[PDB]
């Protein structure tokens, strides 16, 4: 099997896949929706990460951090979501700024969601950490604004022992709303991932 890992203090298009309005600024930040509305953009690490092993049934416990700075320029439906999208039926932690909910949306059916307020993070840096224990089947998310120390967390039991999942493509999917929810931007400047088997 394949256990993979990486640290990105500064993004570079070279090891990235860009769909829709997804780009990389000279300042080394991944950027989605900066020129679009009512659409969805995405970025994925080149290497297709492996989650389930068919040679044992085993599943990868992945762990991952990433700083991001969501803006709306206004003083999922609209937001930024981390996604485990299979290889060309999607586990997705979504930071929906519009429904104002953080949730683990698996196949359009959120397994657990919790409210959070965008104004507690709009403009500054936010630390997100996703983690999934293969042994206890416990998924967990945490949002926290370092500038103050607010953290909208959440957690749930998710079973990925489904034959259909083996290889996924870890990335980001920032969706953009319409009319006044057209201006939201999505900057991600740090991201680390890590899958593991035993």
């Amino acid at each position: 099997a394949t256990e993979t890992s990486f640290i990105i203090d500064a993004f570079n298009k070279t090891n990235l896949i860009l769909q829709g309005d997804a780009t990389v600024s000279s300042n080394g930040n991944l950027q989605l929706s900066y020129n679009s509305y009512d659409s969805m953009s995405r970025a994925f690490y080149s290497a297709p990460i492996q989650i389930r092993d068919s040679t044992t049934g085993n599943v990868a416990s992945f762990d991952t951090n990433f700083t991001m700075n969501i803006r709306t320029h206004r003083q999922s439906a609209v937001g930024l979501d981390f996604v485990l999208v299979p290889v060309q039926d999607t586990v997705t932690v979504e930071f929906d700024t519009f429904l104002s909910r953080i949730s683990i949306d698996v196949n359009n059916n959120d397994i657990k969601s919790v409210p959070w307020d965008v104004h507690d993070y709009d403009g500054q840096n936010a630390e997100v950490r996703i983690t999934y224990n293969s042994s206890t089947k416990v998924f967990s998310v945490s949002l926290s604004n370092p500038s103050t120390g607010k953290s909208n967390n959440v957690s749930t039991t998710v079973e990925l022992e489904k034959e259909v999942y083996d290889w996924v493509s870890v990335g980001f999917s920032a969706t953009s709303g319409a009319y006044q929810w057209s201006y939201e931007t999505h900057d991600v400047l740090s991201w680390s991932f890590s899958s593991k088997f035993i």
């Binding site: 769909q19 829709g20 309005d21 780009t23 929706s33 900066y34 020129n35 679009s36 509305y37 009512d38 659409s39 969805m40 953009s41 995405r42 320029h73 206004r74 003083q75 999922s76 439906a77 609209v78 999607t90 997705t92 519009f98 429904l99 949306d105 359009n108 969706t175 709303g177 319409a178 009319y179 006044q180 929810w181 057209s182 201006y183 931007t185």
Partner: protein, 471 residues
Amino acid sequence: QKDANFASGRNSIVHLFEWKWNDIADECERFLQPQGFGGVQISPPNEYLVADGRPWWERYQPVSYIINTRSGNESAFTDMTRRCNDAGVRIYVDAVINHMTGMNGVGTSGSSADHDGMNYPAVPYGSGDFHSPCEVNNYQDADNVRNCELVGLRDLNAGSDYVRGVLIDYMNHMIDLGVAGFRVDAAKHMSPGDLSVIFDGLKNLNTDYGFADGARPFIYQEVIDLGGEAISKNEYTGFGCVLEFQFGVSLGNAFQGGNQLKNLANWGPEWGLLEGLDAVVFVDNHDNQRTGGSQILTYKNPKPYKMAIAFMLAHPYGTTRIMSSFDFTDNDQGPPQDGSGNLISPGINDDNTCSNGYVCEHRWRQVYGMVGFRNAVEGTQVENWWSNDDNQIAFSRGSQGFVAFTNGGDLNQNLNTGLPAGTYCDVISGELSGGSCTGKSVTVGDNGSADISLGSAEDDGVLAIHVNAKL
């Protein structure tokens, strides 16, 4: 269905964003018509919500179809179609037919709006008339974006006979009043399945306005599709034109300095853009001109923007639409206001600009001069390409016209124009007034081969010349 419909010998349209009706009329016959203009994409004409602070976006929450807007009631509207249409300026209504409102009750023509109970009496409209509530989750799930509430906005069900009936009545009503087309609002959020049935009840144009007997209504749609999503623009091609959204991004990035102009040689379908005659192309747009850093060019960054719409204009692809926005400093700030009202946009004195908060892009030398350029070259395929294999491009539309430009490198070249030997009054900088050029009086020898000189420091990067500028 995808036919432009303009009064012959004329070319492309304008978005007089938020302008008043009677005002439009003035503009229709005073500036648009004299300049070979196609028409106008007329801001939302039907009764919509009175959203506090009265922002441009309020204009996108239908309270009803009663034709009384902040731009005027029917009287002025009807009038606006009668003056404007006679001038040749075709009117194109923004048809917001996927939802109503997401907030409560204040209709711009006294009609209420019970969001909670899903009630719109002006219509009437009730719960049965709407899709079941749910919201826009994954743009990866096709029926979710179409069948749920885009931004908590009550999603109408264009699948029902009653609802199809009403919309149809609305559009046709407009077709009766004169309009030739409809900038369908958010097609991506509607099943193309009945999007057609609605685009069918529309009876042929009102003979009495000037239209060629039995000519169908131009239908262009709003569908943002830059790949990835489960929805495709092509799904709305078999029955109407779509608004090419990549055009703005790509060509925008190009001139922004994000791409070698040399690459625009194969500009066209080879960039993820549908067949030429399938799109309505545009640079910035009322909505996305709000986004800002990067790719999109708005009047905020003039120079490359003009070269941009120029490349558009000059180039043959799809049908074009210039935009006449109003100055803005927020993202929700409403057009000109005073304790409830739209302030007129006189263009004054006359360098032919505009005042009191309206930018009037279309009245800019560079922009309009190029529109007539477009007219002047019709029926001509792409010919005589050229470049410095970097940021200097040049070519011409047959013996009818020519253009060139540069982001970097004084194009002091010695080129061609492939036109009749003569002289020509550039249109960007200049034009012909009283039989003499008001900017650049260039020469062109006995066989196209001419000399060009466009410097970096200049006001602009572009030079157009065409037989309808021959002195």
